[PDB]
Structures are given as structure tokens and as C-alpha cells.
Design a protein around this ligand. Structure first.
Ligand SMILES: *[C@@H]1O[C@H](CO)[C@@H](O)[C@H](O)[C@H]1NC(C)=O
Ligand SMILES: *[C@@H]1O[C@H](CO)[C@@H](O)[C@H](O)[C@H]1NC(C)=O
Ligand SMILES: *[C@@H]1O[C@H](CO)[C@@H](O)[C@H](O)[C@H]1NC(C)=O
Ligand SMILES: *[C@@H]1O[C@H](CO)[C@@H](O)[C@H](O)[C@H]1NC(C)=O
Ligand SMILES: *[C@@H]1O[C@H](CO)[C@@H](O)[C@H](O)[C@H]1NC(C)=O
Ligand SMILES: *[C@@H]1O[C@H](CO)[C@@H](O)[C@H](O)[C@H]1NC(C)=O
Lengths: 330, 332
């Protein structure tokens, strides 16, 4: 547990003792030194602050600290087990708050899970926002000549990782704000669109057009809306773009207005029905852009009674009170 | 018996002889003459060839021929019964061409028939154009103040008289040609208007208006039409003047035209329907009579789709193709 001045120290692979002394020494016998270090392929032994501290580099074989007095017989060696060795490797069960892991023996981490959440750098790996993640991390050693693989450590997560603090579990896809069913931050997996619960609204999107006020619309908020506190759109309504056989569509035949927003519409039926908007531009007959002269012929008739023919322009009998009209346009 | 030169002749009601001679004489004593005629209310005695022939004018009382010689006593009178008095009436069945009848015994003809077609003068009567007539003519004689009535003869026509030549069986009433259902000439009975037949029509009169051409009308000929041949109108049809729910009437509210004819019409319902005519008068907006300034606002829309509000003047969404119109009319 501590380095003593009149003792010899070494690292051992076994506890056995023979006629010439301890068996299985991995290092040579080293005299006491303040800060003295013993080194082999598996461990680094350091004499620090009058205390014995260790740093494992590999755990494939069991290691001991061998102690022998300078005056004593070489067969009087004392061993202190540092760690038990397993060639197939140690199996670590990842706890709920597990984040960082280091693969021993300079092994490469091989991740087998629900979705990739791991950041990898040499033998080091990082589980980034593993919310709902299950699977294993296998520390593997390859061979340049034989091409055989050996496992030195297995990190396992049987049941899903619970919710983790400091993880954004909402992601913008295009302009729509989606929920992260699994993961967080960049490890996020898209589920469904987030729904409007409350809060201040920046704008709303309905039938492919943007609105910031209720005027002209059936109601407000409508369709999907973006909060002043977010960059994406949350789903508010499922309201139909089809109104009286008149469907508001981003690529429409005729332009008209809903409040301040210019809207495009298409006819679904040729029935007599209203437009779900207000006129885009009202052109005058005497207007500078277009000149069209108006003249009309009229006669006396009985109420709701018509004479032949039907107005050339309107294709209908123009009747008001006890009079019939026939217009002539430029 | 015959007449002889040295005898006197007379007509008698009886065979009785008194101290002064014959007592039932109806005529005066007449001397022999070659055509000698004796006349009374019942008989006409004529000695045509020296041989007597008779013509009865009544048979209710018995008549005798009284003969008396010029040299003999007036009580030596001889009587020859001409006929026995028959108090029962005769019954004549009027033939198809029967026209004149004479009531015997100077009786008055009493006519009981379908309609009045008889000309009457004393006992004489005349059936004037009796086409379809049925009934009886009773020759009646009333005596003193008894009030008793006696039928001397009955003229009967059980089945109707057939059509008779030389009788006009069509009469004009105002301007319409009517058919004479019974009679003819002045005895005519008119009940229905003559139905049209033939090729040449002068003019038609439907709903109180005159037409000479098919233009504007439902069809032609229509209503009552006059032939080039006649003065009156003949019935062609009963077609309604109520065209839809609009009536064509001689005294109407609004004037309009059917062909060349100016027609007057009245509304019977306010339901959306057509006028059965063409406009009478077409007044222009820029016309000299009246001036009306026309201006309009328009926008693009979808077919049969409207924007608010309705046209102020038309109280309707003015839509043509993909354009909506709003008119502004101002009187000048
Ligand atoms: C999975 O994880 C690695 C580590 O961040 C990342 O670079 C890689 O792009 C991921 N795979 C995909 C296809 O997103
Ligand atoms: C997730 O992102 C936020 C904001 O960039 C950051 O504060 C947080 O540390 C990230 N979480 C992890 C586990 O990297
Ligand atoms: C503000 O935005 C955050 C996400 O950045 C969201 O979780 C929160 O619910 C929003 N605030 C309100 C009041 O809805
Ligand atoms: C003609 O006939 C009518 C109807 O029967 C009758 O009232 C009228 O008195 C008759 N007139 C003559 C002149 O016979
Ligand atoms: C009817 O009148 C016509 C014309 O005057 C005449 O020829 C005819 O004899 C008349 N018939 C009778 C029976 O009155
Ligand atoms: C005219 O002709 C019709 C037959 O088409 C005939 O009934 C009518 O009596 C004729 N009139 C004259 C005056 O000839």
C-alpha cells in the first residue's frame, strides 16, 4: 500500500515462488525512489505522495505487486494483487448517467445499438444524449497479418437509458419543429411534429401561405404556427384548404387576398359559390391601364319577365324591376 | 146530279120545308147559268159542264143542294145531300217539302213546335225554312162565348224536317260567322260559331288582336280567322291567351310586339318566365330621349365564384367567365 526505503519492488503475472525466488516477474527488481515507477504491458505503478497509485493500460492478464526486502532471502517475496485478468475481457454495465468510456489495451470501440449516439476518438468513446438507447460497445483488437479480432472489454446497456439533462429533444426539419423520440442534440431521431400547447405566436402557416393576423381567415391561430421563442413550426390545426369548392393552394390559377397575405386559389367545382378571399386588384373601365366603353339598351317589361335575346356579354337576361337591359362593351 | 136551264139552285143546311118554302137555305136562289157557282162557309158548288162538281172548305155541318123549278110552287123543293157533318178532326202528316197549309172551317192555326218558323194569315200558315223543326199545327175553332175549343184538323211532324234547298243556314253576329242549328233565312236559330275549313284566309284575330302572318305567334292560323270568301270570322282554335303565366289581353298594362302587330299584356304571376312577345320600344342609354352614364369596376376570379359585395344596381353577382363586374349608373 506504500513504498518503503529498504525494499525492492516489481510487477508480477503470478503469485508462485520457486527455489530462486518469486515466479512470473514481468519487470526487474527496482530499489526504492521517491516517485519510482514500475512499467509493463498491463500496468504503470507509481510511488506518489508516500502512497502507491496505479494506472491500468490493459486488463487481459492478472497483475500483482511483488515486494522483497534488501536484506531478506529472495524466496520471502510478498505479493499484492492489483487486478484480476480476463482474456475475453471485463463486462461493464453502463449506468443511467454514463457518458465517457476508455477502451483498454488501445482497443477500438465497436458500437452496436438502436442508433448512433457515440463520439469516437482512438480508444475513447462518448455516449452523447443516449435517451432511449440500448446496445453494446465492444473494445476490439485487430491483427495486421492474421486478420483475427479479440474483445478486451464490453460496455452494455440492456434497458433504455432514461431522460438526460442538458439535451435538446426537439429538432427543426425544414421549417417544421419535430419531437426527438430517441436521443438529443445531433443524436436526435425524428418522431412526430410538436403540437401547440401555448405561448406567444410569431406567425402561422396555412395552405402554404404566411399570416400574422386573424383578418380574412376562418380563425387564428390556424394550420401550423411558429412561437416567438422558437425557429420551427408547431402543428395547431388540421383545417381544410377546400372552402365551398375553392381550395387555397401555393400554386394556384388566380391571385386574391386574405388580410395582408397574397393567396393563390383553384376551382374544384363550377357551382355558384363564394371566394374565400378578397379581390387582389380592382381594375377600372376608365382606368389608365385599360379603357373599355360602356353602353346599354333598355325596354319596359313585367316583373321577372324577359324578352329575347339574352345579353351578349352576360349570357343572362338582365332584369331590374319592370326593365330589361342589354349591354355593349368595348 | 147536274144543272138544267129552267131550274133554280141553292145550298141548304137542312132538308126541312115550311109554308114559304125551304127553311135551311144558306145561299140565295140562283138561276141556271153555264158556269153557275153557289158559295157558303162550308161548300163551293160549280156547274162546270152542266154537271155539278164540289169543293169542300169545311165539313162540321151537313150540306144539301136545293133544287126548285121556275114554274113550280116554292114548297116543291128537292134536296140532294152533298156530305154528312163530321165533328171529328183530320190529321195530316207534314211531308219533307211541306210549305203551305190552309186551316179548314176558317179556323185559327195554333203552332206548338221547337222554334218559331211559321208565317200566319187568317186560316193560312207557312212553314218558312223548317230545318230540324218538329211539332204540330192545330186548326182551332171557338164558338160564341162557350170558350169550348174544337180541332178541325191537326198538322204533325214527329221526326225533324230535313235540310231544305234555298235556305241560308249561316248568320253573321257582329263579326263572327255563326251556324244556324235550326231553321234558315229569318227563321234561323244560331248557337255556335262556324268552324274553319278551306285554303284562303284574309286575316286572324287572337286575344283581341289582328294577324295576317305567322311570325311571333305559337302557330298560324290561330283563334278566329276570316276567309277571303266571307265577311265574318270562323273559329279555328281555343288556344289560351295565357302564354306561360302572362295573358295577352286587348286592354293590357304593357305594350309589346308579335310580328307586325302591337299587343297588350298583363302579368298573372310574378314567377321568372318569358314574355310571349318582342320589345315594343328600345330606349338607348346614350339615346337622345335619355342619357345615362355607365362605368364599371372589375377583378379576376374563378368560374362561377363571387367576391363581396353584390352589384348595387343589379342586386346580383355580375359574373362573366373569370371576371366579376360592379356597375355604376348615373342619370344625366
Ligand atoms: C454516426 O456517428 C458518427 C460520430 O459522430 C458520425 O460522424 C456519423 O455521421 C454518424 N452516422 C450518420 C450516417 O449520421
Ligand atoms: C447539447 O447541446 C447544448 C447546447 O449546445 C450543450 O449545452 C450540451 O452540453 C449538449 N449536450 C451534450 C451531452 O453534448
Ligand atoms: C419556448 O421554447 C422552448 C424550446 O426552446 C419550449 O420547450 C417551451 O415550451 C417554449 N415556451 C413556451 C411558453 O411554450
Ligand atoms: C218565339 O219563340 C219564343 C220562345 O219559345 C217565344 O217566347 C216567343 O213568344 C215566340 N214568338 C212568336 C212571334 O211566336
Ligand atoms: C231564303 O232567301 C233567299 C234569298 O232571298 C230566297 O231565294 C229563298 O227563296 C228564301 N227561302 C224562303 C223559304 O224564305
Ligand atoms: C268560300 O269557300 C268556303 C269553302 O272553302 C265555302 O264554305 C264558302 O261558302 C265560300 N264562300 C263564298 C261566298 O263563295
Amino acid at each position: 500500500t506504500g513504498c518503503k526505503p529498504e525494499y525492492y519492488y516489481a510487477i508480477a503475472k503470478n503469485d508462485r515462488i520457486g527455489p530462486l525466488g518469486a515466479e512470473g516477474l514481468t519487470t526487474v527488481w527496482k530499489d526504492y525512489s521517491p516517485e519510482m515507477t514500475l512499467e509493463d504491458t498491463m500496468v504503470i505503478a507509481s510511488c506518489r505522495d508516500g502512497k502507491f497509485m496505479y494506472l491500468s493500460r490493459c486488463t487481459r492478464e492478472t497483475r500483482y505487486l511483488a515486494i522483497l526486502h534488501s536484506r531478506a532471502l529472495p524466496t520471502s517475496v510478498v505479493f499484492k494483487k492489483l487486478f484480476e485478468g480476463q482474456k475475453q475481457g471485463d463486462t461493464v454495465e453502463m449506468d443511467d448517467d454514463f457518458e465517457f468510456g476508455l477502451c483498454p489495451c488501445d482497443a477500438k470501440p465497436i458500437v452496436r445499438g438502436k442508433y448512433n449516439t457515440t463520439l469516437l476518438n482512438g480508444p475513447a468513446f462518448q455516449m452523447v444524449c443516449p435517451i432511449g438507447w440500448t446496445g453494446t460497445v465492444s473494445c476490439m483488437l485487430a491483427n495486421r497479418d492474421t486478420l483475427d479480432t479479440a474483445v478486451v472489454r464490453t460496455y452494455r446497456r440492456s434497458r433504455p437509458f432514461p431522460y438526460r439533462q442538458g439535451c435538446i429533444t426537439q429538432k427543426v426539419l425544414g421549417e417544421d419543429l419535430y419531437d426527438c423520440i430517441l436521443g438529443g442534440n445531433w443524436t436526435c431521431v425524428t418522431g412526430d411534429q410538436l403540437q401547440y400547447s401555448g405561448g406567444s405566436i410569431e406567425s402561422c402557416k396555412w395552405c402554404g401561405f404566411k399570416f400574422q393576423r386573424s383578418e380574412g381567415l376562418p380563425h387564428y391561430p390556424i394550420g401550423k404556427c411558429r412561437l416567438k421563442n422558437e425557429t420551427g413550426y408547431r402543428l395547431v390545426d388540421n383545417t381544410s384548404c377546400n372552402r365551398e369548392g375553392v381550395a387555397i393552394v401555393p400554386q394556384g390559377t388566380v391571385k386574391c387576398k386574405i388580410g395582408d397575405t397574397t393567396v393563390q386559389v383553384i376551382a374544384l367545382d363550377t357551382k355558384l359559390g363564394p371566394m374565400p378571399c378578397k379581390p387582389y386588384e380592382i381594375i377600372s373601365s376608365e382606368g389608365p391601364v385599360e379603357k373599355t366603353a360602356c353602353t346599354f339598351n333598355y325596354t319596359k317589361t313585367l316583373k321577372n319577365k324577359y324578352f329575347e335575346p339574352r345579353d351578349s356579354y352576360f349570357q343572362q337576361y338582365m332584369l331590374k324591376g319592370e326593365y330589361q337591359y342589354w349591354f355593349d362593351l368595348e
